[PDB]
Design a protein around this ligand. Structure first.
Ligand SMILES: CC(=O)N[C@@H]1[C@@H](O)[C@H](O)[C@@H](CO)O[C@H]1O
Ligand SMILES: *[C@@H]1O[C@H](CO)[C@@H](O)[C@H](O)[C@H]1NC(C)=O
Ligand SMILES: *[C@@H]1O[C@H](CO)[C@@H](O)[C@H](O)[C@H]1NC(C)=O
Ligand SMILES: *[C@@H]1O[C@H](CO)[C@@H](O)[C@H](O)[C@H]1NC(C)=O
Ligand SMILES: *[C@@H]1O[C@H](CO)[C@@H](O)[C@H](O)[C@H]1NC(C)=O
Ligand SMILES: *[C@@H]1O[C@H](CO)[C@@H](O)[C@H](O)[C@H]1NC(C)=O
Lengths: 262, 199, 247, 50
C-alpha cells in the first residue's frame, strides 16, 4: 500500500481497472487515498550446459527488479541485470561471441574456461569491406563442386479410437448415459478418419511421378563419376542402398514404441 | 501490460533487439549495391554499379547499349521515385494496415480473458475469497467447483484460438523468406512475384 | 554431355567441363564420401524427422494418463463407482466422470487436426522440390541447395525424403581493371557476351564466371553509336579477321 | 489449489502449448533476416554512378 495522487470526491471511495478491481482505498479512519499492488511474481528458468559436462547451473527470474527480491533455493554473488530479468551465475564479459544458449534481449549464455558458466552481448558476424572502385572487377579463376543435404517430413502415424471402449469401458448403464448426449462420439470418429486418409494421399503425390519403373544399365560406367553409394544394390536383401540404410538405422522410435500383431 | 502483471498475463520481451535487426538489413543493402548477386552465393565479388545495372537490363531483354547511353535519364527517374515513396508512406491513411492488424487482433483476445474472470459462471460471487466467506466448506466447494470449470474452459478457448492464428503468421514468414532469397539476393523471372512489370 | 548442357545453363561455356573432366570427377566422388561420414556422425542432423514421431507419442500418452482422474467425483473405476452407491447417486458421479473423459478426447482430436495441417504444408513443398530440382534444373536462387544449382538426387528415409543437392560454387578470386566499352575507329564497340578486362597491358574479353581471355575481334563485339556519349570509354584495337584472308 | 490438482494435467498441458508458440516466433525472425554471415559495410566514397 502507498499514498496516492488520486482526487476523489467526498462521495467516491475505491479504484477500478478495466478489470473492475480495487486499486485504491480511503482510510476509514484517516480518510486518505492509498494504492494497492500485490508483490512481484514471475516464472523461473534454469540454464544448464547438460549433465554430461558439468553440474553447475544458472538461474533467471523472467523479470523482477532484482535490486531487492531474493522457492527453496539459496543465493550467492554475481548478480547481473538484463532487460529480460535477473541472472545469477554469469559475468558481464566485454568480449563477444556467437550465440550458443538463448536468454533474451540480446543476451546469450554459455559455458567456458577453472571453467565456469558465463554470459555475453551476442555478436552477429565478422566485419569486412568490399573495395569499390568505379573501375574494378573480380572474375573467379577456378571452381569447386559441393554436395549438401536437406530433410523434409512427409507423413505422420495413422491412429483410431472407439467411443464406448474409452469413455464408458464396457458398462451398459454407462453406454446408456453416453447415449443421452448427442452424436459427439460419432462426429469425433469421422474427423480422425479424414486425417488418416489424407496422410496416405500425401505420400503418393511426393514419390509417384515416374510412370514406368526404369532400371539402371548393368555396366556402371557414367563418365568417371561414381554413383555406387546412392544406386540401390540388388545383392543387399532390402533393395535400399548404402546411404538409405544408414538413415533408417539412426531414426529410432521403438524406444517408447513397440514393433512394426501390434 | 502491468495490469496484466496483476493477473498472471506476463508479456515476455524480444530475443533479437530492434537495433540488431537494423544491423542485419543494412548488411543486405550494402551487399546488393556493391557485390551484385554474388553476396549470397560464394564470396563477395566487387562490380561497378553501372555494370551491375547493365547485366540486369540484359536479363529483361533490352540490350546493354540503352543503359550505358541514356544513363542520365535512368538516374534522375530513380532518384525522384524514392522521393515520392517516403512522401506517400507518411502522407496516406493506413498503408501499413497488415502490420497494425496483427497487434490489434492479439490484444482483443487477451482483454476478453481478463473480462471473463468477473463472470459469476452460474454461482453466487466472483471473488473466490468472497465465495469462501459466508459459505460452509461443503457448499463453498460446490460453488468453487462451478467457478473453476468456467475459468478452465475460457483459458482452453484462448489457447486454441492463438495456435490457429500462429499458423497464419508463420505462413506469411515463409513467403517473406522466399522473397528475400529470390528478389533481394538475385533477379526473379517469375512474373509478378517481385513487383509489377519487369523486375 | 548431360553435365555439359547443365554447365552451359549456369553460365560457364561447355569448354570448361570437357577440358578439366578428371578434376570435376574427383571432387564429386570425394564429396559423396564425406556426406556418408557426416550422416553416420553428428547425431543431430536427423532433426525434423524424429520431431514428428516425438510429438505424436507425447499426445497419445497424455490421453491414456487422463483416464486416472477423479474429475471431481469419488472414484475412477466405473465399476467401483457403481459399488457401494445407489443408482441415483452413482449416476451423478458417472455423469461427472463421463463429461471429464469426453472433454479430454475432444482436446486430443482438435490438437491432431492443427498438427496435420503443418505436415500437409511440408509435403506440398517437397512435391514442388521433386518436380523442379529433381526432374529438371532450377535457376531459382537457394530454392535448391546453395549457389548455382546443377543436378539433384532423391533418397528415402523413415517417414520422409532426403534430397542430396549438387551445386557449383565459384572460388579463388583475382583483380582485373575493367571499362564499359572500347572505341577503335570513331564507332564504339560494346562487349557481346562478356566483360572487357585489362591485365595491365592489352585488353581481352572473358566469360563472367570463369577466366578465359580471348583476343577482342569483330566477332566478340557489336557496333553501336559514336564513341563520345559512353561515360568511361577507353581506346585499344579491334583485330577483325579479314585483311589476312584478302591478302 | 487442492480442487484444481484433482482435475488433472489441464494446467501442465496449457503452459507447454503457449511456450511452443513463443519459441517458434523467435525462429521466424531469424530465418527471414539472417541469411548473410559476413556483416558487410558501405564504402565511404558515395560514387554510385549518379
Ligand atoms: C526536352 C525535353 O522535354 N526533355 C524531357 C524533359 O522531361 C526533361 O528534360 C527530361 C527529364 O530528365 O526528360 C526529357
Ligand atoms: C477515530 O479515531 C481517530 C484516531 O484515534 C480519531 O481522529 C477520530 O476522531 C475517531 N472517530 C472517527 C469517527 O473517526
Ligand atoms: C531497482 O530498484 C530500484 C528501487 O530503488 C529502482 O531504482 C530501479 O527499479 C532498480 N535500480 C536501478 C537500476 O536504478
Ligand atoms: C568491461 O567494459 C566495461 C564497460 O565498457 C568497463 O567498465 C570494464 O572495465 C570492462 N572490463 C574489462 C576487464 O575490461
Ligand atoms: C571514380 O571514382 C573516383 C571517386 O569518385 C573519381 O576519381 C571519379 O569521380 C570516378 N570516375 C572516374 C575516375 O572516371
Ligand atoms: C585488388 O587490388 C588492390 C590493390 O591494392 C588490393 O588492395 C585488393 O586486395 C585487391 N583485391 C583482392 C580481392 O585481392
Amino acid at each position: 500500500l502507498t499514498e496516492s495522487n488520486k482526487k476523489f470526491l467526498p462521495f467516491q471511495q475505491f479504484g477500478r481497472d478495466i478489470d473492475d478491481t480495487t486499486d485504491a482505498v480511503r482510510d476509514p479512519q484517516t480518510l486518505e487515498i492509498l494504492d494497492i499492488t500485490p508483490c512481484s511474481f514471475g516464472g523461473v528458468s534454469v540454464i544448464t550446459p547438460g549433465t554430461n559436462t558439468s553440474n553447475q547451473v544458472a538461474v533467471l527470474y523472467q523479470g523482477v527488479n532484482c535490486t531487492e527480491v531474493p522457492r527453496v533455493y539459496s543465493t550467492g554473488s554475481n548478480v547481473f541485470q538484463t532487460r529480460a530479468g535477473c541472472l545469477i551465475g554469469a559475468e558481464h564479459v566485454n568480449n563477444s561471441y556467437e550465440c550458443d544458449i538463448p536468454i533474451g534481449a540480446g543476451i546469450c549464455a554459455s559455458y567456458q574456461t577453472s571453467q565456469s558458466i558465463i554470459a555475453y552481448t551476442m555478436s552477429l558476424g565478422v566485419e569486412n569491406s568490399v573495395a569499390y572502385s568505379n573501375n574494378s572487377i573480380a572474375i573467379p579463376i577456378n571452381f569447386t563442386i559441393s554436395v549438401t543435404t536437406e530433410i523434409l517430413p512427409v507423413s505422420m502415424t495413422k491412429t483410431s479410437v472407439d467411443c464406448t471402449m474409452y469413455i464408458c469401458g464396457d458398462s451398459t448403464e454407462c453406454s446408456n448415459l453416453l447415449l443421452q448426449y448427442g452424436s459427439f462420439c460419432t462426429q469425433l470418429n469421422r474427423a480422425l478418419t479424414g486425417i488418416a486418409v489424407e496422410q496416405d494421399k500425401n505420400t503418393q503425390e511426393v514419390f509417384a511421378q515416374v510412370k514406368q519403373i526404369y532400371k539402371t544399365p548393368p555396366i556402371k560406367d557414367f563418365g568417371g563419376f561414381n554413383f555406387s553409394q546412392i544406386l540401390p544394390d540388388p545383392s543387399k536383401p532390402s533393395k535400399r542402398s548404402f546411404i538409405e540404410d544408414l538413415l533408417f538405422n539412426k531414426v529410432t522410435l521403438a524406444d517408447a514404441g513397440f514393433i512394426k500383431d501390434l | 501490460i502491468c495490469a496484466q502483471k496483476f493477473n498472471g498475463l506476463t508479456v515476455l520481451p524480444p530475443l533479437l533487439t530492434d537495433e540488431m535487426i537494423a544491423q542485419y538489413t543494412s548488411a543486405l543493402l550494402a551487399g546488393t549495391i556493391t557485390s551484385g548477386w554474388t553476396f549470397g552465393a560464394g564470396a563477395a565479388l566487387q562490380i561497378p554499379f553501372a555494370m551491375q545495372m547493365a547485366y540486369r537490363f540484359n536479363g529483361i531483354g533490352v540490350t546493354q547499349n540503352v543503359l550505358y547511353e541514356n544513363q542520365k535519364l535512368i538516374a534522375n527517374q530513380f532518384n525522384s521515385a524514392i522521393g515520392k515513396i517516403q512522401d506517400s508512406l507518411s502522407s496516406t491513411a493506413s498503408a501499413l494496415g497488415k502490420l497494425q492488424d496483427v497487434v490489434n487482433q492479439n490484444a482483443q483476445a487477451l482483454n476478453t480473458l481478463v473480462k471473463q474472470l468477473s463472470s459469476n459462471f452460474g454461482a453466487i460471487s466472483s471473488v473466490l475469497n468472497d465465495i469462501l466467506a459466508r459459505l460452509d466448506k461443503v457448499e463453498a466447494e460446490v460453488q468453487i467447483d462451478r467457478l473453476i470449470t468456467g475459468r478452465l474452459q475460457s483459458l482452453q478457448t484462448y489457447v486454441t484460438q492463438q495456435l490457429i492464428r500462429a499458423a497464419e503468421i508463420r505462413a506469411s514468414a515463409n513467403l517473406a523468406a522466399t522473397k528475400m532469397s529470390e528478389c533481394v539476393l538475385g533477379q526473379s523471372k517469375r512474373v509478378d512475384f517481385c513487383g509489377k512489370g519487369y523486375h | 554431355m548431360q553435365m555439359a548442357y547443365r554447365f552451359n545453363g549456369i553460365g560457364v561455356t561447355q569448354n570448361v567441363l570437357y577440358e578439366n573432366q578428371k578434376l570435376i570427377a574427383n571432387q564429386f566422388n570425394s564429396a559423396i564420401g564425406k556426406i556418408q561420414d557426416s550422416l553416420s556422425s553428428t547425431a543431430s542432423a536427423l532433426g525434423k524427422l524424429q520431431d514428428v514421431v516425438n510429438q505424436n507419442a507425447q499426445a497419445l500418452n497424455t490421453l491414456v494418463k487422463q483416464l486416472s482422474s477423479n474429475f471431481g467425483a469419488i472414484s475412477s473405476v466405473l465399476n467401483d463407482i457403481l459399488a457401494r452407491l445407489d443408482k441415483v447417486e452413482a449416476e451423478v458421479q458417472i455423469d461427472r466422470l463421463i463429461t471429464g473423459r469426453l472433454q479430454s478426447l475432444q482436446t486430443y482430436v482438435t490438437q491432431q487436426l492443427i498438427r496435420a495441417a503443418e505436415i500437409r504444408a511440408s509435403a506440398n513443398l517437397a512435391a514442388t522440390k521433386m518436380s523442379e530440382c529433381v526432374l529438371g534444373q532450377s535457376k531459382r536462387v537457394d530454392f535448391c541447395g546453395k549457389g548455382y544449382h546443377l543436378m539433384s538426387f532423391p533418397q528415402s528415409a523413415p517417414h520422409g525424403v532426403v534430397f542430396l543437392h549438387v551445386t557449383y560454387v565459384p572460388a579463388q578470386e583475382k583483380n582485373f581493371t575493367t571499362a564499359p566499352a572500347i572505341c577503335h575507329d570513331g564507332k564504339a564497340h560494346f562487349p557481346r557476351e562478356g566483360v572487357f578486362v585489362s591485365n595491365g597491358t592489352h585488353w581481352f574479353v572473358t566469360q563472367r564466371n570463369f577466366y578465359e581471355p580471348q583476343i577482342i575481334t569483330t566477332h566478340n563485339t557489336f557496333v553501336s553509336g559514336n564513341c563520345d556519349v559512353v561515360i568511361g570509354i577507353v581506346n585499344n584495337t579491334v583485330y577483325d579477321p579479314l585483311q589476312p584472308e584478302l591478302d
